Design an enzyme around this catalytic site. Structure first.
Site, short mmCIF file in Angstrom:
data_model
loop_
_atom_site.label_atom_id
_atom_site.label_comp_id
_atom_site.label_asym_id
_atom_site.label_seq_id
_atom_site.Cartn_x
_atom_site.Cartn_y
_atom_site.Cartn_z
CG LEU A 127 -13.97 -28.41 -10.15
CD1 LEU A 127 -12.46 -28.52 -10.18
CD2 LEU A 127 -14.43 -27.62 -8.94
N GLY A 187 -17.08 -29.43 -20.18
CA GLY A 187 -16.40 -28.97 -21.38
C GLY A 187 -16.95 -29.66 -22.61
CG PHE A 235 -12.99 -31.80 -26.40
CD1 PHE A 235 -13.09 -32.46 -27.61
CD2 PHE A 235 -12.79 -30.43 -26.40
CE1 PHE A 235 -13.00 -31.77 -28.80
CE2 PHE A 235 -12.70 -29.73 -27.59
CZ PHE A 235 -12.80 -30.40 -28.79
CG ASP A 266 -4.55 -21.76 -27.08
OD1 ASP A 266 -4.78 -20.63 -27.57
OD2 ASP A 266 -5.45 -22.51 -26.65
C1 LIG Z 1 -4.68 -30.45 -13.61
C2 LIG Z 1 -6.05 -30.57 -14.33
C3 LIG Z 1 -6.40 -31.96 -14.64
C4 LIG Z 1 -7.17 -29.81 -13.67
C5 LIG Z 1 -7.08 -28.30 -13.50
N1 LIG Z 1 -7.15 -28.16 -12.08
C6 LIG Z 1 -8.31 -27.37 -11.76
O1 LIG Z 1 -8.69 -27.06 -10.57
C7 LIG Z 1 -8.97 -26.99 -13.05
C8 LIG Z 1 -8.22 -27.55 -14.09
C9 LIG Z 1 -8.64 -27.34 -15.48
C10 LIG Z 1 -8.07 -27.79 -16.78
C11 LIG Z 1 -6.95 -28.56 -17.15
C12 LIG Z 1 -6.67 -28.81 -18.49
C13 LIG Z 1 -7.53 -28.28 -19.52
C14 LIG Z 1 -8.64 -27.52 -19.17
C15 LIG Z 1 -8.93 -27.26 -17.80
N2 LIG Z 1 -9.93 -26.56 -17.20
C16 LIG Z 1 -11.02 -25.87 -17.94
C17 LIG Z 1 -10.85 -24.37 -18.13
C18 LIG Z 1 -10.41 -23.88 -19.52
C19 LIG Z 1 -8.94 -23.87 -19.82
N3 LIG Z 1 -8.48 -23.02 -20.87
C20 LIG Z 1 -9.78 -26.59 -15.77
C21 LIG Z 1 -10.58 -26.00 -14.68
N4 LIG Z 1 -11.72 -25.24 -14.70
C22 LIG Z 1 -12.11 -24.91 -13.41
C23 LIG Z 1 -13.20 -24.16 -12.91
C24 LIG Z 1 -13.36 -23.98 -11.51
C25 LIG Z 1 -12.44 -24.55 -10.62
C26 LIG Z 1 -11.36 -25.30 -11.11
C27 LIG Z 1 -11.19 -25.48 -12.53
C28 LIG Z 1 -10.19 -26.19 -13.35
#
Ligand SMILES: CC(C)C[C@@H]1NC(=O)c2c1c1c3ccccc3n(CCCCN)c1c1[nH]c3ccccc3c21
Length: 267
Positions: free
Chosen positions: A18, A21, A23, A131
């Protein structure tokens, strides 16, 4: 000992990345071939747990419909974190994306209400986010918004532009300092993803804000919503509104505040 959230590694299956990052990365997958999940992996060895599971440790003690749900964890390398899957990704990317062009005030205000609703719960639990901003807000289907990213977000006992003065200068992070960030978040929604304080760097804004400068009313944004931003931007944090007020104000916005709203070219 053992972990109550700990599931076996063969219980899940990573499919689509998805977004990488600095980290780790986030993957869409299937938990037990039935549960649609979003797995947050790990990229060794910058972090390298401090503990890295602290993101989940707080997500264990918290549960709300407007908060991104924690499902399970994996303690052995490679470390994984299982949770709720948000299809549309980050709010910032969503606002800056194609859909941001078609968003109007009714949808934007409603999204802020959900966040205010989620933060109202956090307020009741006596927690702080430290944040709160559009980049840390996940959006799913039907324009649902949920608070996410709980790094060092704990009890009561560098995004300077989004941060309140007393939190940036003296490290006084309160729920009232999150309210400040919510006001900044409201500018991100009304500008559809534009960085707050345009043409202004971290050092000059901190000095300018301390002197009393506040961001002007963004184009096509009504005065009543701008006033709400200013209330969140009051110098004395005790005078800032509660999220209980923020949630209620936004939910009843187009009936009790702006009943004569007429759509414009952008808002
Ligand atoms: C519950 C968790 C484990 C997953 C969460 N669920 C998603 O679908 C999703 C998630 C996160 C996430 C959680 C914790 C920390 C950073 C996270 N990020 C990066 C984004 C910057 C946050 N400031 C996520 C993200 N990025 C996307 C891009 C496209 C589709 C889904 C997610 C997507």
């Amino acid at each position: 000992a053992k972990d109550a959230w700990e599931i076996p590694r063969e219980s899940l299956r990573l499919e689509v990345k998805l977004g990488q990052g600095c980290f780790g990365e986030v993957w869409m997958g299937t938990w037990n071939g039935t549960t649609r999940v979003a797995i947050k992996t790990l990229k060794p060895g910058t972090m390298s747990p401090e503990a890295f599971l602290q993101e989940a440790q707080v997500m264990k003690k918290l549960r709300h419909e407007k908060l991104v749900q924690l499902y399970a964890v994996v303690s052995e390398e490679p470390i994984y974190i299982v949770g709720e899957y948000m299809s549309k990704g980050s709010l910032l990317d969503f606002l800056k994306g194609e859909m941001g062009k078609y968003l109007r005030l009714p949808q934007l205000v409603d999204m802020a209400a959900q966040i205010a609703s989620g933060m109202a719960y956090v307020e009741r639990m006596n927690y702080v986010h430290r944040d709160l901003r559009a980049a840390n807000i996940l959006v799913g289907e039907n324009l649902v918004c949920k608070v996410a990213d709980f790094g060092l977000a704990r009890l009561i006992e560098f995004p300077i532009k989004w941060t309140a003065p007393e939190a940036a200068l003296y490290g006084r992070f309160t729920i009232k300092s999150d309210v400040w960030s919510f006001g900044i978040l409201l500018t991100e929604l009304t500008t559809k993803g534009r960085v707050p304080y345009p043409g202004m760097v971290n050092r000059e804004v901190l000095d300018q804000v301390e002197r009393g400068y506040r961001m002007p009313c963004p184009p096509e944004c009504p005065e009543s919503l701008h006033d709400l931003m200013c209330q969140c931007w009051r110098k004395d944090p005790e005078e800032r509104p509660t999220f209980e007020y923020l949630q209620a104000f936004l939910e009843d916005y187009f009936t009790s505040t702006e009943p004569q709203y007429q759509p414009g070219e952008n808002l």
